[PDB]
């Protein structure tokens, strides 16, 4: 893994709208994102 | 009404100069060729213009390696 | 009913390693006076072998398989250093001081360099 | 199903080659080589007229009993070299047919 040519990559936590948490690394430096639908609440996954 | 042809380069007098079994001196030209029709074998070098020459004294031999014809020099026993 | 389709990375690595070894062998060859130190480096062990490509006959050989090298603790590089020392000693014994080193289609960044340096300090010209 | 093999006298060849074959054809004998699983190619001369008659009466796939100096050998006409102009059988490749 190269030293600095590789862009930063920090672990982050996200919370969906239905209230499901999620932890994963993403380019977002803030570390706290707010996702709306997510796959735990999307209609396609849930049913119908 | 004439011909667009009529040109031709000098014959380059290529080919094998020392054939199998001929005793040659070191540095002797063995094959004048374009490309490696024959490849440099043992005690045989390849010139800039693809001229195969003997690197050591001996007798010219023609062999085959990996399906490629090669020119080798077999050392000649001292008398 | 399972049929492999992808060329396994092991097979790719073997084919490419043989490819690189032949590429090197175009210029590197062993002789009675200046043998060829072939190196085979696996994920487990490292082996080296002084070949005379004129006869295809080996004069000396060393391996990490040996009980001595296995007893030697440390790292893979330590074992490769011991193997290099062993092959240098055995080349001395066989009467071989200068050879050509065949890296077998490998790189600096591993055991090959360590073995090479082991033979250097041992006394072989490699 | 099958049929009686056609009898043909096929003397062995004392001399073989281009001149020998041409002389045999001039004499009126088609040269032939009999080979097969026995692994023993034999160089024979079949009477040209009789051999051609057998071929044209029973076809190329006609089994032949060749009398080769007394011995009888079954063989089928594996191949026929025929001259395109003279239309004569230049040569016969016979394949032994063990029964």
């Amino acid at each position: 893994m190269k030293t600095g040519i590789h862009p930063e990559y920090v672990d982050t936590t996200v919370q969906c709208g239905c209230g499901h948490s999620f932890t994963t690394r993403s380019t977002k430096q803030s570390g706290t994102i707010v996702v709306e639908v997510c796959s735990q609440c999307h209609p396609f996954y849930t049913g119908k | 009404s004439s011909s667009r042809n009529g040109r031709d380069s000098a014959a380059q007098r290529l080919g094998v100069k020392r054939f199998g079994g001929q005793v040659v001196k070191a540095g002797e030209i063995l094959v004048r060729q374009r490309g490696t029709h024959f490849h440099p074998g043992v005690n045989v070098g390849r010139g800039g213009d693809d001229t195969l020459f003997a690197l050591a004294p001996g007798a010219v031999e023609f062999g085959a390696k990996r399906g490629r014809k090669t020119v080798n020099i077999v050392p000649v026993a001292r008398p | 009913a399972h049929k492999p389709v992808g060329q396994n990375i092991s097979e790719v690595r073997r084919n490419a390693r043989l490819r690189r070894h032949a590429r090197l062998r175009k210029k590197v060859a062993g002789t009675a006076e200046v043998p060829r130190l072939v190196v085979n480096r696996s994920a487990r062990h490292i082996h080296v072998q002084l070949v005379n490509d004129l006869n295809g006959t080996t004069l000396a050989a060393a391996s990490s398989i040996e009980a001595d090298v296995r007893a030697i603790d440390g790292d893979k590089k330590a074992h490769s250093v011991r193997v290099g020392q062993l092959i240098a000693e055995r080349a001395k014994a066989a009467g071989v001081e200068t050879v050509v080193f065949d890296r077998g289609g490998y790189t600096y960044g591993g055991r090959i360099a360590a073995l090479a340096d082991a033979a250097r300090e041992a006394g072989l010209k490699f | 199903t099958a049929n009686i093999p056609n009898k043909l006298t096929a003397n062995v060849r004392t001399r073989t080659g281009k001149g020998a074959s041409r002389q045999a054809r001039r004499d009126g004998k088609v040269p032939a080589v009999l080979y097969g699983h026995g692994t023993d190619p034999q160089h024979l001369e079949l009477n040209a007229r009789d051999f051609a008659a057998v071929l044209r009466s029973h076809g190329t796939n006609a089994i032949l009993t060749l009398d080769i100096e007394g011995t009888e050998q079954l063989a089928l006409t594996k191949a026929l070299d025929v001259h395109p102009i003279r239309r004569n059988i230049q040569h016969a490749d016979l394949l032994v047919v063990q029964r």
Binding site: - | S2, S3, N5 | - | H83, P84
Partner: protein
């Protein structure tokens, strides 16, 4: 007519009229055939004439094969020109025919009509030619 779509070299040396034909010497398509007995540069015009003769003799039924193709260009220099000043332009398209070569083949139910049509073709041709048959 029969003319190649293209030729790699349009000014070729004359085909060597030597030896008997080594290939195409038997009827491989039809029942009857016309076997050449002499060497000749059979031109595309001669091929056209022979095939038209065969087709017009057999009228309605039957099938005709033309084994030889005139893909060899014989050149001709302009009229009343002296020797030299290059090679002439392609003039004729010929098939190098050798003895033993089967030039045309015919399938037709009536043997007499087939032979008469092949005889027409032979008369159109510039060589000695015989009617050979598939049955050997």
């Amino acid at each position: 007519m029969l003319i190649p779509r293209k030729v790699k070299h349009r000014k070729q040396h004359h085909p060597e009229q030597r030896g008997i034909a080594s290939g195409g010497t038997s009827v491989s398509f039809g029942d009857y055939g016309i076997q050449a007995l002499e060497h000749a540069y059979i031109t595309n015009r001669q091929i056209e004439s022979a095939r038209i003769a065969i087709n017009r003799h057999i009228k309605r039924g039957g099938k005709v094969w033309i084994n030889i193709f005139p893909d060899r260009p014989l050149t001709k220099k302009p009229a009343e020109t002296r020797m030299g000043s290059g090679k002439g332009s392609p003039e004729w398209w010929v098939a190098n025919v050798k003895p033993g070569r089967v030039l045309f083949e015919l399938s037709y139910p009536d043997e007499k009509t087939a032979r008469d049509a092949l005889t027409r073709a032979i008369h159109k041709l510039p060589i000695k030619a015989r009617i050979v048959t598939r049955e050997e």
